[PDB]
Amino acid sequence: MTTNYIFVTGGVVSSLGKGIAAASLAAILEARGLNVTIMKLDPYINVDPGTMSPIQHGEVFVTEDGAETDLDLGHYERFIRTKMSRRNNFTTGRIYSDVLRKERRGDYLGATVQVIPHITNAIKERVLEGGEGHDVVLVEIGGTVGDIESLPFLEAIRQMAVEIGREHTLFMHLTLVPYMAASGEVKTKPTQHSVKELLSIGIQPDILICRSDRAVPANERAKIALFCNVPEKAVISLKDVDSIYKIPGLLKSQGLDDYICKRFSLNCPEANLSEWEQVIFEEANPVSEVTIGMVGKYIELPDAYKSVIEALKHGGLKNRVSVNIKLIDSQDVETRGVEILKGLDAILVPGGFGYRGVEGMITTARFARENNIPYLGICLGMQVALIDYARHVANMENANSTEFVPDCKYPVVALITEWRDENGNVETMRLGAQQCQLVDDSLVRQLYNAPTIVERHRHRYEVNNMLLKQIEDAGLRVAGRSGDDQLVEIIEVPNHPWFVACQFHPEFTSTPRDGHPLFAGFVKAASEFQKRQA
Amino acid sequence: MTTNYIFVTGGVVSSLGKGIAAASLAAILEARGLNVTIMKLDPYINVDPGTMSPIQHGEVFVTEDGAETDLDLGHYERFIRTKMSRRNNFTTGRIYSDVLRKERRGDYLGATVQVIPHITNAIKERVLEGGEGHDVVLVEIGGTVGDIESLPFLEAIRQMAVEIGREHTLFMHLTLVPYMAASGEVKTKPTQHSVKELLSIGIQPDILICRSDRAVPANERAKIALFCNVPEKAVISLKDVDSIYKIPGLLKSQGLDDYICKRFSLNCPEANLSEWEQVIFEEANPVSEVTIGMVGKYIELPDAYKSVIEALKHGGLKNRVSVNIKLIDSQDVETRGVEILKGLDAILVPGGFGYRGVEGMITTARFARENNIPYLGICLGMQVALIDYARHVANMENANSTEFVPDCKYPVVALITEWRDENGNVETMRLGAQQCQLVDDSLVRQLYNAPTIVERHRHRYEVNNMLLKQIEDAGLRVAGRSGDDQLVEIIEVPNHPWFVACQFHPEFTSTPRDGHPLFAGFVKAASEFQKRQA
Amino acid sequence: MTTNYIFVTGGVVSSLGKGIAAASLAAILEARGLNVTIMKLDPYINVDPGTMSPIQHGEVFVTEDGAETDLDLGHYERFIRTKMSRRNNFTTGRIYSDVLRKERRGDYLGATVQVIPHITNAIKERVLEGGEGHDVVLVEIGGTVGDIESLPFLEAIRQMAVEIGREHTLFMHLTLVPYMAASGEVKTKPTQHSVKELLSIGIQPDILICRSDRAVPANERAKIALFCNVPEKAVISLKDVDSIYKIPGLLKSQGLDDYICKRFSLNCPEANLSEWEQVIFEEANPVSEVTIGMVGKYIELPDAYKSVIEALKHGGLKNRVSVNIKLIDSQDVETRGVEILKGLDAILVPGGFGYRGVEGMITTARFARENNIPYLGICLGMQVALIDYARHVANMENANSTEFVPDCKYPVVALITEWRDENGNVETMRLGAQQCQLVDDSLVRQLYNAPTIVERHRHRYEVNNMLLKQIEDAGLRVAGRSGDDQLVEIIEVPNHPWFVACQFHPEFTSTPRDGHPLFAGFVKAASEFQKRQA
């Protein structure tokens, strides 16, 4: 058994969906019965993604082993059943940190540490590490070809291609074949140049991917084949589609995987695309529909709440109901007011960091609570809901979080060390999948059908138990607590049709095939309420 | 008075409309009271455009001095009142022909002839020639930046610019700021790279043109300004529009010309944009509409019949009537038949070269003639009509052209030398504006209101006078004859509502403001016939 | 039998001896019993080398078939027995001439003629033509890698290589490993970059040639091997030597040919290096010595008279005598006078073009003649001697050539058409090997031992028969006449110890193993004179 590698690059423009393409391929090769894995090389200087905001790159993926990483690692989880780890993704900054530390420790024995060969060796080692024991390793190269931001990686690859041997490596490259309406046709010139750029750095493409909003004519594919030194059969067209789960079908349709096994000589098992067929069937045969408002801050870029959006979708799939998300700026709730929240079947408040429109978020929580409108709060949404209830029911004037106000007077949220009461009497970040203790008498315990659950976290502040008894005794249900210090994990409203909120991130566990009890209940409640109001 | 120059380049993709942008600018500069002219340099090896087909590059422009040249010079004359002479356009091959000839005759005295400096000097000298006596000279560089096809020219410019000084030169550069619907936004990266490419060959852009299908946000323009070393006000946005005549307005709106005179310190007279204001009014307030069929061969690319389409538009403007053109493949008329020609108010048959389905063109001519449907024939279309009438009225068995069948038996079209009768008894290319004697009693004479006219030509074969008397005596009007040998120029059908066909190319002389008698009459007839058939 | 190809390129700096290296290799391949040939592509606009001066590029080689070509073709003749032809050498300009002509006559049927693919087609077809029927074909690419002057050729090659497969092609690249005395060591960086440049245009080197003034250390060769993706054994060191004839030995020493046949898997015959062993023996064991003075014009770059220098050397080899050549400027004899000509054992006057100090050349001819100093005149040197004798012995005041002074009055040299006497009564270029009728009673007839001989030519003006009779009757022996027109091919002075001058070019036939009668005679006479003067 010898590991085979396929490198995935792309040029001309960004935003082509390199990770999507790679993931779809992996799904097929999985369906061919191969031991497929995948890694992504991140050109950024940031060592860890935790040093960047949600608005900067969208959601940060949490791996099983607790590592924080590129969102695309979650995308990989949605196409292949293998598990990602810290070994599946690292950054440029990470590399330098490691190398410089080795230098400091005398690891290079007085030698000059140079990009070539030392930085590239660091890269080479990491690649071999992650691909160890696998049949096929896909490697996504971030950045854009021709930019200096990733040339070191491209060089390391070239070296490995030579050292390993061409019989175990392929070069896949994404391009853009844009449609020029003024001319009434697509152009190939950009592609031709993109390939030339790879060639100038020692890389000859084997497989071409033509991204566009429409199928590229065979004639044009042939023209490309000519200029790029690539067989026509290896020039794959990839038009835009309305679902990433249809891509495996397209790649299979054009014989991509067969080519690879012949190279690529692979004994690939018959593709099991029935999962996609199911999705298609359900898509093409809806029965209801509900409208769910999403009040937040980063709504100007859907990607910021991508994992949430998909979790909602999955709940809808299980209940055969369309999910219509209304994006709402919490700051507009502060300006315009609750009129925004009208015409909704359910209310949802996502997590995140930053104050901005948080008071409007509270107003919304209040609105949904007081008007009995199916409410779901996550992380920050829970913090908000806590304040809402506390201030307007438990009478905790200015209930707040110490992350925004040093002297809240009624710090309902604070660091455990910072826990204190309204009289000033007292007494890092929770990450990854953690076990939570559910209250047997709670709704969510029964939704999960289990005494305890394990769910992912990403936050530093906690419910201030010094003032919890005020809130809870006022008439609020704690549906779950955590571990050692029984930190509040889930809250339910005693007489609200469906109002829940939690500390964990259920949106990182939800799948299209399994769904997720919480979102199933939420979306269902939306429907129930909709009918209740009709 | 010292001549100022502005160079126009473009990159990322082809087909951005460099000629359009340049012409629009020139129009404004003329409107500012400046002696502005324009030249275009081509990256083609073809010495003359006469060696290429209409399908290859579209219509070939006919200049006043008889030179055959780039179509864009027609566009240049449609915006400024100066004339596009042979000095206003030349190719790469042209240059080499000249230089090699100079070498052959000893003009380089035993020296090595090199791109640098000899080819670049040849280019430079031609530019200086054309720019003589002008205030502002625009120079359009064909090809795409980064491609080897025009690097010599870019180099020649660099040299020139240095020699004449920056105070007499500006660098304008077109780019693409494509919209990526998947991201929901436009991208600037391609532009940044395009500029870097010019810089790598010694050229620093002064003015940027952002081509797109929508206005580019000031923020994005600022980002570009940053990365390109260009002032924000010199970054011009240019969204797609439905008419070239609206571009001067846009460029003026963004202050482009003011910048230039400040650089450009120009004492520019108030722009006279009333010509387009007129057009806008008429466009916005049409009174009728007609449908006119166009039977030909190169209909897969409208540009092939561009000048014709424009002329038709001009007839429509004068008659306040919309002109709906139906493109028809002559091979389909040949195959499917005259059913194609139904539902039309008028029939038009354009000129060109190639057999393909010319028999179907003849069928169409017959159809329009026999059914009295407003017919207009141009160049070849006249030859087609000649055959039609001859064979089916004058009983000229297989009336035809010797260019396809030497032994026609009734060679109605042949070279003057080749003129012969049906018994075999006997006895280059006509180019440019030539005087034609109109028959005072013809309609066309009265349409022009003149004894004679001067119109442009482009053909080799003539009406075979050996058999003309057969055709003419059968009942057909020769509405005009040339000069020297009174060659048949225009034919009219005695009892047809509006049947005119001619050897010359009226489409190269019409304007949107002056119109053109033949299209005025033709389109009017279409309307009359439309009402007749109702 | 399938033809194998090896391409030769060079980077960093020019003048590394690409032709030398290629010829040396070919010699070895022939020595191994392989059908090897060689071609050279030249990056020049000049169509034919005949349009350039001797001082510009040095001697222009005359091939068997009369083609004028690059000097290096003669160098190829000195290493292998495969005969060169017009198919073995052509220029960039030649290509364009051919292609443009094809365009003109319609060979491209209306298509766009582009560098790619049409210019590259012209190139690759010529390559395949010349390589027909050979086992191994060496192709030398002139110019320097990274320069635009030869990128089209490099591209044509890349394409070809792909088309024929790597099993039939190798890339040999020359570089420079400069010695930096300030550092006390050689550097390799330039080489590393040179290789990178080839890679950027799609070419990966297989064999590296390290030119220097000293052997390159294995360590440095290894460093290069690393950075260039080349096996250590394929990195060849090539230090400067005092004789080209020693290079085959060096290449053989490093196992180059074995590698090639293994690739390169070649059943190569044992190298016969005895030709150089002979030379070495003779070189290291001279017996006499003699001083030869040469008067000319292009002495500022010995390459101009390279073929002559070699021919003199060959005469010396046959007479076991060292040849000491004094370089004399004709303009100095003109200025300083005959004092320059003192201390010489014999005097030689070469051919060429340009009036310059030719009067000093005439003065020299006079000097050698009148002082009985062995003399050898070639082409122009004959014209010079003719004038000398004519003016001073035959009393032909202002004896001269019409090529410099049309109105001579005693045009001893003139175009055959221009032949005339002093009273005005009258009555292109001769090239290649032509038969000359020798006079049986002449020395030259006996030196060659044959009634007639065949020798190469290159000149436009001939001995003026109208006045010849004055010169010949005055006491000058015509040692041989051409043929049809009995043109004075060669003369001898009746009472001069050894004074011979001719129209032909004996220097293009002389070899180190065969020698040549006129140089044997001249050099011997030179020695004899020396001894007579001592």
CA distances in angstroms from B152 to A108, B119, B203, B504, listed in the order given: 49, 8, 13, 38
Report the chain C residue with the minimal C-alpha distance to residue B96.
C96
Tokens for C37, please give them.
């040939």
* Partner residue opposite C52 with nearest CB, options B93, B96, B110: B110
Following DSSP, what letter does each residue of B132-172 receive, concatenated? Answer: TT-SEEEEEE-S-TTSGGGHHHHHHHHHHHHHH-GGGEEEE
Helix or strand holding residue A473 (H, E) = helix A468-473
Q: Furthest-apart CA pair in chain B: how many Å?
A: 79
Residue of C nearest to B92 (CA): C114
Chain A residue numbers with beta carbons less than 8 Å from the beta carbon of C199 are 200, 202
The pair of three-digit structure tokens given for residue C232, joined into one six-digit string: 């250590």
| Count of alpha carbons within 13 angstroms of residue B431, beta-carbon side | 13
Q: C52 to chain B: which residues are within 8 Å by CB?
A: 110, 112
Rounded Cα distance between A44 and C127, Å, is: 49
CA A13 to chain B, closest CA, distance in angstroms equals 7
Between helices B120-130 and B92-104, what is the axis angle to 10°?
Answer: 110
Identity of the residue in C53, C96, C111 whose CB atom sits nearest the CB atom of B96: C96
Residues B157 and C501: their CA atoms lie apart, in Å, by 55
Distances (CA, A) of B81 to A249, B472, C99: 59, 41, 39
Residue C505 a catalytic site member:
yes
- Name the packing angle between helices C189-200 and C218-228 (round to 10°): 30
B113 → closest Cβ in C45, C110, C114: C45
Report the C-alpha gap between A485 and A278 in whole angstroms. 44
> CB–CB of C401/C414 below 8 Å?
yes
| Assigned token pair, A490 | 């889930």
Rounded alpha-carbon distances, angstroms, from residue C317 to B442, C275, C313, C320, C327: 96, 13, 6, 5, 21
Q: How many CB pairs under 8 A join A and C?
A: 9
Distance CA C318, CA C332 (A): 32
Which tokens hold the place of C241? 């030597």
Contact of B103 with chain C, judged by CB distance below 8 Å, is answered with yes
Report DSSP letters for A57-81, one per residue.
Answer: HSPPEEPTTS-EE-THHHHHHTT-S
Residue A226 corresponds to which tokens in the numbers above? 């000519």
DSSP A355: -
CA angle C69, C140, C76 (to 5 degrees): 55
DSSP class of residue B507 equals: G
Q: How many angstroms from the chain centroid is the CA of residue A529?
A: 30
Q: Respond yes or no on whether the N-terminal peptide bond of residue C117 is cis (omega within 30° of 0).
A: yes
Asked if the Cβ–Cβ distance from B189 to A13 is below 8 Å, we say yes
- Give the number of other Cβ atoms within 10 Å of residue A46's Cβ: 15
Tokens of C115: 């560098």
**Annotated binding residues of A for Mg(2+), as ranges?**
72, 140
Q: Calculate ∠ Cα C305-C311-C313, nearest 5°.
A: 105
Helix boundaries (H) for C44-188: 54-57, 72-77, 92-104, 120-131, 151-164
Among all residues of chain B, which has the CA nearest to that of C45? B113
Catalytic option among C268, C379, C408, C436: C379
Q: Which tokens in the block code for residue A193?
A: 């140049």
- Interface membership of A219 toward B (CB under 8 Å): no
- The arrangement of strands across the sheet holding A207-212 comes to A89-91, A36-42, A136-141, A4-10, A169-176, A207-212, A235-239
- Is A335 at the interface with chain C, CB within 8 A? no
Which residues touch C102 (CB under 8 Å, ≥6 apart)?
A: C108
Q: Hey, is the C-beta of A121 within 8 angstroms of any chain C C-beta?
A: no
Report yes or no: A247 and A254 within 8 Å, Cβ to Cβ.
Answer: no
User: Is the separation of the CB atoms in A433 and A64 below 8 Å?
Assistant: yes
Helices and strands (DSSP H and E) totals, chain A:
18, 23
Phi, psi values for residue A174, rounded to 5°:
-90, 140
A132 and chain B: CB distance < 8 Å anywhere? no
CB contact under 8 A, A187 and B14: yes
Catalytic residue (one of C77, C502, C507, C516): C507
Resolution of the entry in angstroms: 7.9
- Check residue B304 and give left, alpha or beta (phi > 0: left; psi -120 to 50: alpha): alpha
CB contact under 8 A, A190 and B12: yes
Dihedral angle, C-alpha B160, B164, B166, B170, nearest 10 °: -60
Q: How was this structure determined?
A: cryo-EM
CB–CB contact A213 B181 (8 Å): yes
Q: How many Cβ atoms sit within 10 Å of the Cβ of residue B33?
A: 15
Rounded CA gap, C312 and C323, in Å? 7
Count of pairs with CB atoms under 8 A, one residue in B, one in C:
53
Residue entry with tokens 């590129």: A70
Nearest CA in chain B to A187: B13
Q: Give the DSSP H or E segment for A248.
A: helix A247-253
Cβ contact (<8 Å) for A144 and B180? no
Helix-strand-coil split of chain B, %, nearest 5: 40, 20, 35
Which residues in chain B are contacts of C111 at CB distance < 8 A?
56
Q: Are C191 and C177 in contact (CB under 8 A)?
A: yes
B264 touching C (Cβ < 8 Å): no
Q: Are C31 and C248 in contact (CB under 8 A)?
A: yes
**Beta pairing, strands A462-463 & A410-414:** antiparallel
Q: How far apart are CA A25 and CA A29, in angstroms?
A: 6
* Cα nearest neighbour of B182 on chain A: A15
Cβ atoms of C78 and C511 closer than 8 Å: yes
By residue count, chain B amounts to: 534
Subunit contact A229:C199, Cβ cutoff 8 A: no
Collect all residues of chain C within an 8 Å Cβ-Cβ radius of residue B200.
Answer: none
In order of C328, C365, C372, the CA distances from C336 in angstroms are 11, 15, 21
Decide: residue B280, CB within 10 A, 0-12 exposed, 13-18 middle, 19+ buried.
middle
User: Is the CB of C46 less than 8 angstroms away from the CB of B110?
Assistant: no
d(CA C2, CA C264): 13
Cβ within 8 Å, pair B15-A146: no
Q: What is the amino acid identity at position A250?
A: L
Report the SS3 class of residue A25: helix
Q: How far apart are CA C407 and CA C388, in angstroms?
A: 18
* DSSP collapsed to 3 states, B23-86: HHHHHHHHHCCCCEEEEEECCCCCCCHHHCCHHHHCCCEECCCCCEECCHHHHHHCCCCCCCCH
CA atoms of A78 and A62, how far apart (whole Å): 14
* Binding-site residues of A for UTP: 14, 187-192, 223
- Out of C51, C110, C151, name the one closest to residue B56 (CB): C110
Question: What number of residues does chain C have?
Answer: 534
8 Å CB contact of B103 and C46: yes
Query: Measuring CA to CA, which residue among A321, A327, A289 is closest to residue A308?
Result: A327
Q: Please answer yes or no on whether C229 and A162 come within 8 Å at the CB atom.
A: yes
Active-site residue (options: B210, B379, B436, B502): B379
Please tell me whether residue B427 adopts helix, strand or coil conformation.
Answer: coil
For residue B65, the Cα-to-chain-centroid distance in whole angstroms is 16
The binding site of B for Mg(2+) consists of 72, 140
Cα distance between residue B99 and residue B104, in whole Å: 9
- Domains of chain B plus CATH, in order, are 1-285 (3.40.50.300), 286-534 (3.40.50.880)
SS3 assignment, position A501: strand
CA distance to A167, B3, C62, per residue, from B265 (Å): 65, 13, 63
Query: From residue B281, how far is each of A322, B277, B284 by CA, in Å?
Result: 49, 6, 5
User: Would an 8 Å CB–CB cutoff place A14 in contact with chain C?
Assistant: no
SS3 C55: helix
Q: How far is CA C523 from CA C117, C321, C364, C499, C527, in A?
A: 55, 8, 18, 12, 6
HSE of A88 in the Cβ direction (CA atoms, 13 Å)? 29
Task: For residue C176, list its beta bridge partners.
Answer: C211
3-state percent breakdown (helix, strand, coil) of chain A, nearest 5: 40, 20, 35
- Rounded to an integer, what distance in angstroms lies between the CA atom of residue B55 and that of residue B69? 15
Closest Cα of chain C to A119: distance in Å? 15
For B44-82, b/e burial (b = at least 16 CB within 10 A) is bbbbebebbbbbbbbbbbbbeeebbbbbbbbbbbebbeb
> Which residues on adjacent β-strands are paired with residue C430?
C459
User: What is the interface size between A and B, counted as CB pairs within 8 Å?
Assistant: 36
* Other C-beta atoms lying within 10 Å of the C-beta of residue A43: 18
Question: Any idea which residues of A carry the catalytic annotation?
Answer: 379, 505, 507
